[PDB]
């Protein structure tokens with residue numbers, strides 16, 4: 001069977017906490033008063049919810065309400081517990097309230113978001129570095145708190161551009177990291193799935209989030225959304241292999257003694273590792289630096305153990321200007 005793996009960092013953070021921190025099955029939800037909110041307008045939909053703008057009539061605050069579709073009580077408890085554990089951390093969305101009426105509804109802080117597919121197009125080199133740094137602060141925090149997001153992607157990053165304000169949202173797929181735990185690989189949107197998910201390696205960790213982040217960075221600096229455009233989960237690994245190369249993929253599989261689905265054998269083929277130069281063009285060149293490419297290269301690795309940590313990523317030369325400016 002497959003070789004075990006442990007997170008390089010924050011390995012035992014949960015083991016050292018009282019049981020109640022991570023044992024979300026035991027959590028008892030604190031319900032607020034539904035009558036404090038009036039729905040204003042529909043914002044959109046999710047896999048597990050319908051999302052509204054509302055107003056708290058107690059204090060006239062704008063709020064966002066996520067009314068949950070039918071989900072197991074333990075999955076709702078997990079998201080609540082994680083949001084409560086992370087509350088106050090840098091750039092983490094605030095869960096304001098939990099209400100029922102017998103559908104349960106999560107009430108969040110409102111972020112005045114600029115349209116994903118209209119904001120990114122205006123971003124400068126500096127803007128990308130700045131917002132990437134802000135996401136890294138949220139990820140280092142949640143990882144340090146023993147939590148994997150497992151769904152990092154543009155839709156889950158709210159940006160109020162006028163206020164240079166960012167929040168990482170939608171903790172519905174997030175989970176506590178426990179050394180030895182075999183996690184569900186059916187997580188994350190296709191284009192952002194890490195190689196560990198695609199090859200069915202269950203003993204993954206915080207490093208999953210760093211792959212997803214690298215996918216985001218590539219899409220932003222290269223003006224290519226998505227970067228890895230697979231047709232399905234199988235073809236998704238092929239798209240990755242056409243860039244990172246098949247030699248390193250098969251090295252990863254060997255190292256962990258992973259049993260590769262036989263479907264893959266006739267589709268992965270043989271690919272060279274490509275230089276990042278082939279994605280640079282006259283339109284995107286203003287976003288691309290040696291620093292950007294070095295950083296990206298160090299996130300997008302097959303081997304989860306070799307990817308930068310959040311805290312290592314924050315020390316990369318790509319961010320030196322940002323770090324100086326924040327003083």
Ligand SMILES: CCC(=O)Nc1cc(Nc2cc(NC3CC3)n3ncc(C#N)c3n2)ccc1C
Nearest residue numbers: 044045046051064066108110111112113169170
């Ligand atoms: C809260 C529901 C969730 O977890 N995901 C989600 C959010 C959403 N839209 C949104 C949209 C906004 N602001 C936009 C209207 C100006 N905000 N602001 C804060 C939050 C939050 N949290 C937010 N979610 C649309 C679809 C889904 C699935």
